[PDB]
Amino acid sequence: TCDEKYANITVDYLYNKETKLFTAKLNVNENVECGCTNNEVHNLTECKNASVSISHNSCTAPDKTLILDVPPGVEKFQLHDCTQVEKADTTICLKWKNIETFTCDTQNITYRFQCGNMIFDNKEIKLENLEPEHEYKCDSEILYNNHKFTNASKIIKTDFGSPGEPQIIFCRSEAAHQGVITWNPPQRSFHNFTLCYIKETEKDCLNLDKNLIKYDLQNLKPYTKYVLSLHAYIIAKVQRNGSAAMCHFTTK
Numbered sequence: 671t672c673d674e675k676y677a678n679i680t681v682d683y684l685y686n687k688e689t690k691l692f693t694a695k696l697n698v699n700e701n702v703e704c705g706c707t708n709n710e711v712h713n714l715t716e717c718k719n720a721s722v723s724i725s726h727n728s729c730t731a732p733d734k735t736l737i738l739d740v741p742p743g744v745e746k747f748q749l750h751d752c753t754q755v756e757k758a759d760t761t762i763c764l765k766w767k768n769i770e771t772f773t774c775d776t777q778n779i780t781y782r783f784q785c786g787n788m789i790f791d792n793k794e795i796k797l798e799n800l801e802p803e804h805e806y807k808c809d810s811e812i813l814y815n816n817h818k819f820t821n822a823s824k825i826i827k828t829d830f831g832s833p834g835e836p837q838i839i840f841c842r843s844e845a846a847h848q849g850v851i852t853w854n855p856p857q858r859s860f861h862n863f864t865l866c867y868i869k870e871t872e873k874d875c876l877n878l879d880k881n882l883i884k885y886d887l888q889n890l891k892p893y894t895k896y897v898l899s900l901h902a903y904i905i906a907k908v909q910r911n912g913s914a915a916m917c918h919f920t921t922k
């Protein structure tokens with residue numbers, strides 16, 4: 671009987687973004703008859719059970735009554751980049767968002783991701799310790815009753831990382847109220863330098879142009895131990911500071 675021959679028949683769901691309708695592809699070799707041109711049932715509404723009566727000349731009545739459990743709307747899911755701005759240079763957070771309600775039960779909805787060669791099974795995923803200034807291709811798919819109905823790829827860039835630290839050539843007093851700091855610039859990309867002079871509980875900071883490699887410090891307490899801090903910062907999706915290069919000298 672056709673009900674016997676096709677009792678365990680399987681289906682693949684193909685979404686049309688223009689029509690907002692699904693096509694059910696019947697996983698059979700022979701050209702089957704319904705009541706389904708090229709073994710495809712077209713124009714199926716999302717999250718609605720539809721019935722198809724299947725037969726073929728190679729089998730007798732009763733027909734196989736096949737229930738199509740149609741998945742949710744492909745446009746109702748959005749692959750969102752949830753990366754926290756402060757950690758954008760070393761992390762990736764990807765999450766599928768449910769942008770519109772659907773009637774399908776969510777317990778039958780499964781999300782899968784593939785980043786490098788790592789495979790994840792969850793609505794959201796998080797990658798850490800990534801090297802800054804690189805691009806990664808994360809592939810993802812959504813299953814309904816273990817049936818893939820949608821997929822997407824997300825190419826993500828790991829934002830400008832923290833620069834430096836700079837290499838201090840020297841820092842010495844050259845007058846009773848003066849001290850000089852000279853350095854070499856740090857290796858990564860940055861916007862400016864931040865110089866600090868520390869006299870015990872006291873601390874005053876500055877802002878130096880990326881192009882300078884020397885600084886003069888006037889109006890200082892004579893015969894006093896000073897500590898200079900120097901780091902370079904970059905204004906990325908957040909201000910990222912490089913590690914500080916310490917310096918010590920004592921006035922004349």
Ligand SMILES: *[C@@H]1O[C@H](CO)[C@@H](O)[C@H](O)[C@H]1NC(C)=O
Pocket residue numbers: 689712713
């Ligand atoms: C139904 O599907 C056919 C193609 O199989 C298409 O030509 C037709 O416009 C669709 N009708 C509706 C109402 O979506």
Ligand SMILES: *[C@@H]1O[C@H](CO)[C@@H](O)[C@H](O)[C@H]1NC(C)=O
Pocket residue numbers: 717718719737739740774775
């Ligand atoms: C379709 O039918 C099955 C039983 O065959 C039922 O459990 C399921 O809830 C129905 N699908 C939807 C979308 O409600």
Ligand SMILES: *[C@@H]1O[C@H](CO)[C@@H](O)[C@H](O)[C@H]1NC(C)=O
Pocket residue numbers: 821822823
């Ligand atoms: C969905 O998956 C298939 C098979 O892996 C792939 O060929 C297709 O390109 C994917 N869809 C998109 C939009 O990339």
Ligand SMILES: *[C@@H]1O[C@H](CO)[C@@H](O)[C@H](O)[C@H]1NC(C)=O
Pocket residue numbers: 861862877878879905
């Ligand atoms: C660098 O420092 C100067 C002086 O403090 C300032 O005018 C400039 O806007 C700073 N650069 C950036 C990118 O903030």
Ligand SMILES: *[C@@H]1O[C@H](CO)[C@@H](O)[C@H](O)[C@H]1NC(C)=O
Pocket residue numbers: 864903908909910911
């Ligand atoms: C970076 O350094 C500045 C001084 O240059 C400091 O005021 C600020 O707290 C630091 N920024 C961040 C985001 O840690």
